[PDB]
Amino acid sequence: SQMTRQARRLYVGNIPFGITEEAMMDFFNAQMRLGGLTQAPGNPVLAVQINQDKNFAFLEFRSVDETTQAMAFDGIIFQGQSLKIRRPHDYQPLPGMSENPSVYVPGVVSTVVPDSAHKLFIGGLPNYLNDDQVKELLTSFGPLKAFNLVKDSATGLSKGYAFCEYVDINVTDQAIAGLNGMQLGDKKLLVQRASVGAK
Ligand code: NA
Ligand code: NA
Ligand code: NA
Helix, strand or coil, X not given: CCXXXXXXXXXXXXXXXXXXXXXHHHHHHHHHHHCCCCCCCCCCEEEEEEECCCCEXXXXXXXXXXXXXXXXXXXXXXXXXXXXXXXXXXXXXXXXXCCCCCCCCCCCCECCCCCCCCXXXXXXXXXXXXXXXXXXXXXXXXXXXXXXXXXXXCCCCEEEEEEEEECCXXXXXXXXXXXXXXXXXXXXXXXXXXXHHCC
């Protein structure tokens, strides 16, 4: 249906270099099924359009409700990268239909890290570390509620700093103690609440 198309599409950012539309479709169709999010036989994702130059994709789903459920995959790791899943900017919630996902996907860590009391900044990361490896560094201290590694939009290369929020706010000081000042060749990690050094 044409009226619901805006409510059946999602933006996916930070996609792996060189990924094909078929590989992305298969990934999401499988994850939807394995996660218990798919609501009928057959594929929930109908199509994927990739903008290779600009590093983003749009997924199109067969139903409004499956599209909403797929928002729960925000931050899922695909080929080392934390996929950013968002509504299209022109999306308008429909009457009587839900706007937010209802099913949690175990192990998936959101990419939305709002400014808050215990949001952490991690600066000085080696630029060869992908999203997955930086997530593992941080998860050593405890489970994350949210995380984003900052990249150069034109090249896709890590800018060497990230933000995060732990599930347990009390882990924040443990990560600071374990990581702040750590020396890595020419780099020295700065790990502190992001409010301390925000511009
Ligand atoms: Na990227
Ligand atoms: Na880009
Ligand atoms: Na945007």
